[PDB]
């Protein structure tokens, strides 16, 4: 049932990506802006069987699409999502400017920032915790080096194509 995943209305923020447990309709379509697979060929997917098929979905900025790949680096890859170096699956993305774009800005979707340690492959950190700081306790923001660990996107109806929102879903196969 891929329709539940590729046609849902509510999506999750990148710091709290959603996981699901489970082809010609996919690779014959032309709406998808990006379509890349690692370790396997899309045309050969009908000739194999697997026990597990996971689907992960979230929304990110258009400029950050390149970060969803094995061996990449950046804020999203370091603190929000991370693929192994021997990943096996596909990455799908398409423009979503007609949705998730309100006059004045959405400020609904968030992304983590100022984390202290890089994430391990396939893990999520969702709880808003005490603010990142130095050697001094912090319970607010006054702390000139104290910062709230989350930030919000500023999606608006008019912006550069690089700043428009994109919906992305990642498929994983394992037996």
């Amino acid at each position: 049932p891929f329709g539940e995943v590729f046609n849902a209305t509510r999506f999750a923020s990148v710091y709290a990506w959603n996981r699901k447990r489970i082809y010609s309709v996919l690779y014959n379509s032309a709406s998808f802006s990006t379509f890349k697979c690692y370790g396997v060929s899309p045309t050969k997917l009908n000739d194999l069987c697997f026990t597990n098929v996971y689907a992960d979905s979230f929304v990110i900025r258009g400029d950050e699409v390149r970060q969803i790949a094995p061996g990449q680096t950046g804020k999203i890859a370091d603190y929000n999502y991370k693929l192994p170096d021997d990943f096996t699956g596909c990455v799908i993305a398409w423009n979503s400017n007609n949705l998730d774009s309100k006059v004045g800005g959405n400020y609904n979707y968030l992304y983590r920032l100022f984390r202290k340690s890089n994430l391990k492959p396939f893990e999520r950190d969702i709880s808003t915790e005490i603010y990142q700081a130095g050697s001094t306790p912090c319970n607010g923001v006054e702390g000139f080096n104290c910062y709230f660990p989350l930030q919000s996107y500023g999606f608006q109806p008019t912006n550069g194509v690089g700043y428009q929102p994109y919906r992305v879903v990642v498929l994983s196969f394992e037996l």
Partner: antibody
Amino acid sequence: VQLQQWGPGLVNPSETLSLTCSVSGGSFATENYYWSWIRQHPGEGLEWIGNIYFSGNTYYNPSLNNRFTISFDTSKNHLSLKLPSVTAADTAVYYCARGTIYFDRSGYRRVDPFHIWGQGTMVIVSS
Amino acid sequence: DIQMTQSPSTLSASVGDRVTITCRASQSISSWLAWYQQKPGKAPKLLIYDASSLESGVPSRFSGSGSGTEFTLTISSLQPDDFATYYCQQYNSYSPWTFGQGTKVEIK
């Protein structure tokens, strides 16, 4: 990830050159990546030596007279460059890089340009 | 097999000016071309790929376009950090990969 290089700084005008490149925080054993060697003569453009893929396949530069050699070392997870019988024209900087391989929607196989580079190594031919 | 040609060999400009560079190929290539920048005594870095795709983390003032046998790299507004050497490289699947001659930019 970081790449480190090891090599001799001086070499006699007719001897064997040996370089080594490595990685930290990862591993070479992966069918997703490929490696190459680049060199640059002093005050000149860049030159491409060749490529090595997972499973040991290789692809060299025809302009060069197949003097070079590229190989893995699974006992240490290193990659090395070999050049025997060096001459005066072998003084340059040498780089090791990495890339990525993926499949297209139509089913073809594509490649990405280099995106990780080493610090380089300088070698001089003594006498 | 395949060959390139860069022009101009040397170029002079000033902060805030417009700069254009052209990379030409001997035979048609299906947009498999990239651009690199190199500072003195440092390893290069990637700016453009596929002749039109921008790299992650590079400023938006860089742009490129073209296909087949003519390509161009354009800088909208020169900054003090944009004075360096630039190279064009192609990674076609039917021929060995090769680099360009390089072009240099300096302050007027």
